[PDB]
Design a protein around this ligand. Structure first.
Ligand code: ADP
Ligand code: SKM
Ligand code: CL
Ligand code: CL
Ligand code: CL
Ligand code: CL
Length: 166
């Protein structure tokens, strides 16, 4: 089982906190977005473009179940993995860290970024708020620990998690 599984919205810091947390614990980071691109040979945007979200979600659930069984380090899930009921069921029993972020800050963290299909293009603040309203209940449901990241720098987030683990 991973030492920690990180969930939350795009820009909440999964990739960032995951890397820093894994370094701290001296384990590997498995980022499921990365794992998907290495598996398929394709970019996430290109899977979404040609195959669509539903196919991305099926591939993502396969990857996630396997990593939950086989990975003993830190595991960072894609931001929308919790929208899959099978991912949510696979997460039961696991140490799941919900990185919380306000929409205003989340928007600003993701602002330069053009590699997220569900956020790209215009009207980003609206789209982000809509994602947060849909998913917040789902993150809260799978989480065993919640960490507010709005006013915390990444090293402080890591230390907060470290102190609450194990
Ligand atoms: N606690 C934080 N304080 C400041 N910036 C952060 C924090 N967490 C993440 N970031 C920044 O936000 C951006 C998105 O982080 P990322 O780790 O890729 O989020 P996710 O994987 O949840 O999409 C990155 O530039 C990262 O440096
Ligand atoms: O919010 C989402 O559904 C996504 C977030 C990213 O982590 C990637 O998994 C992908 O762009 C989908
Ligand atoms: Cl399984
Ligand atoms: Cl590991
Ligand atoms: Cl299950
Ligand atoms: Cl984007």
């Amino acid at each position: 089982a991973p030492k920690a599984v990180l969930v939350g919205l795009p820009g909440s810091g999964k990739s960032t906190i995951g890397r820093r947390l894994a370094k701290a614990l001296g384990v590997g980071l498995l980022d499921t977005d990365v794992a998907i691109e290495q598996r398929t040979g394709r970019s996430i945007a290109d899977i979404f473009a040609t195959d669509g979200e539903q196919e991305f979600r099926r591939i993502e659930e396969d990857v996630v179940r396997a990593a939950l069984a086989d990975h003993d380090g830190v595991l960072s899930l894609g931001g929308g993995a919790v929208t899959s009921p099978g991912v949510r069921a696979a997460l039961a029993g696991h140490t799941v860290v919900y990185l919380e972020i306000s929409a205003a800050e989340g928007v600003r963290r993701t602002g330069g970024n053009t590699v997220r299909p569900l956020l790209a293009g215009p009207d980003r603040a609206e789209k982000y708020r809509a994602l947060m309203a849909k998913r917040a209940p789902l993150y809260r449901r799978v989480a065993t620990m919640r960490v507010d990241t709005n006013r915390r720098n990444p090293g402080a987030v890591v230390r907060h998690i470290l102190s609450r683990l194990q």
